[PDB]
């Protein structure tokens, strides 16, 4: 498999969206370029909460989910399983077995303007807590009182809240660019792979060989045996390779 996925263009966007409709990118059938550590989507925080991230290279990757959000600085550590909050539970919950790398830039020079930015919209009121990895887009006025919310009035609160940033605001209210590379498995769907090192072939010598999981010892010689294009292995009487 000789294919390369350009990771670098995926992670940065021209304009980041709101909480309501982000973008989810799935990556497969490509060489695992996770040496983009420290200079792209994994960087400064380097908070790979995955269970043994180096041993995840052995558990050969079947899907990669890449995401890029922008969240305020008061709740950077809120992206972890088991934590509560209105901006945590009613926006994005994580399952208890999250395996991946979730890393946050101090985005103060590109997500803040002198006139103020109003392109990031959040919720603080919802009917109930949602299932993890789910999104709601529909904008409806919730019923937060005895009065029926059929009109725009008191006890009927809009759920949309647009955060505001400038370079003059202090740390904690500044926007942070949080990028997620998550490598989990749904029910271990062992479908596609990548890491597969191959030594150079050697002929006419007594060597050990391993071809597609078949191990053995002997001498490999070119010959006039012909295979129809389905068949891969060869075998004879008494069932020896």
């Amino acid at each position, epitope marked *: 498999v000789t294919n390369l996925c350009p990771f670098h263009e995926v992670f940065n966007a021209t304009r980041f969206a709101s909480v309501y409709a982000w973008n989810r990118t799935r990556i497969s059938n490509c060489v695992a370029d996770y040496s983009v550590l420290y200079n792209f989507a994994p960087f400064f925080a380097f908070k790979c909460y995955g269970v043994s991230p180096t041993k995840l290279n052995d558990l050969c990757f079947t899907n990669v989910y890449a995401d890029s959000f922008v969240i*305020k600085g008061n709740e950077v550590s809120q992206i972890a399983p088991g934590q509560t909050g209105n901006i945590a539970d009613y926006n994005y919950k994580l399952p208890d077995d999250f395996t991946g790398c979730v890393i946050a830039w101090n985005s103060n020079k590109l997500d803040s303007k002198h006139s*103020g930015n*109003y392109d990031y919209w959040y919720r*603080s*009121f919802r009917k109930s807590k949602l299932k993890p990895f789910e999104r709601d887009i529909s904008t409806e006025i919730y019923q937060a009182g005895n009065k029926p919310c059929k009109g*725009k*009035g*008191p*006890n009927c*609160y*809009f759920p949309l*809240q*647009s*955060y*505001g940033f*400038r370079p*003059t*605001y*202090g*740390v*904690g*209210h500044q926007p942070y660019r949080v990028v997620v590379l998550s490598f989990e498995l749904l029910h271990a769907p062992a479908t596609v792979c990548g890491p597969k090192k191959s030594t150079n072939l050697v002929k006419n010598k007594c060597v050990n060989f391993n071809f597609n999981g078949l191990t053995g010892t002997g001498v490999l010689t070119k010959s006039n045996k012909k295979f129809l294009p389905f068949q891969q292995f060869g075998r004879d009487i008494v069932d020896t390779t």
Partner: nanobody
Framework: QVQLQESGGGLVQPGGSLRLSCTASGIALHTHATGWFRQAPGKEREGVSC????????YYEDSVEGRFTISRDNAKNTVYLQMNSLKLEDTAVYYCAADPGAVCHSGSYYYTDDDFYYRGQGTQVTVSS
């Protein structure tokens, strides 16, 4: 979309008291940060008080010290400014404005002049003998 309505005012005498109320219809208080700004005739607009999104953390100006109290009620979604010991130079028109996030005093940024998103019409408070 979202409107802010002010109430109160009248003819107060020096030594008296008055209470302004600012009611938001659409947006939610105790998640928004609201403040009071005033404008005297022949002058430029200057803030009075502010309260942030988190709890009831109050902020105040230099000529506002000790006489003016700010309180927010989340039941009626209406913020209250209580005026005590009004002096003769306090005749102005008062505006309430809201700005999402804990906007007032966030690092190297005070609530100087007006950059708030939501506005109102204003109520005239005059004081004289």
């Amino acid at each position: 979309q979202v409107q802010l309505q002010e109430s109160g005012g009248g003819l107060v005498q020096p030594g008296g008291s008055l209470r302004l109320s600012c009611t938001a219809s659409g947006i939610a208080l105790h998640t928004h940060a609201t403040g009071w700004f005033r404008q005297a005739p022949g002058k430029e607009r200057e803030g009075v008080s502010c309260i942030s999104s988190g709890d009831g953390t109050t902020y105040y100006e230099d000529s506002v010290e000790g006489r003016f109290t700010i309180s927010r009620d989340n039941a009626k979604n209406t913020v209250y400014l209580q005026m005590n010991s009004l002096k003769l130079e306090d005749t102005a028109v008062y505006y309430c404005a809201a700005d999402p996030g804990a906007v007032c005093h966030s690092g190297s940024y005070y609530y100087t002049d007006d950059d708030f998103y939501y506005r109102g019409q204003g109520t005239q408070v005059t004081v004289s003998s």
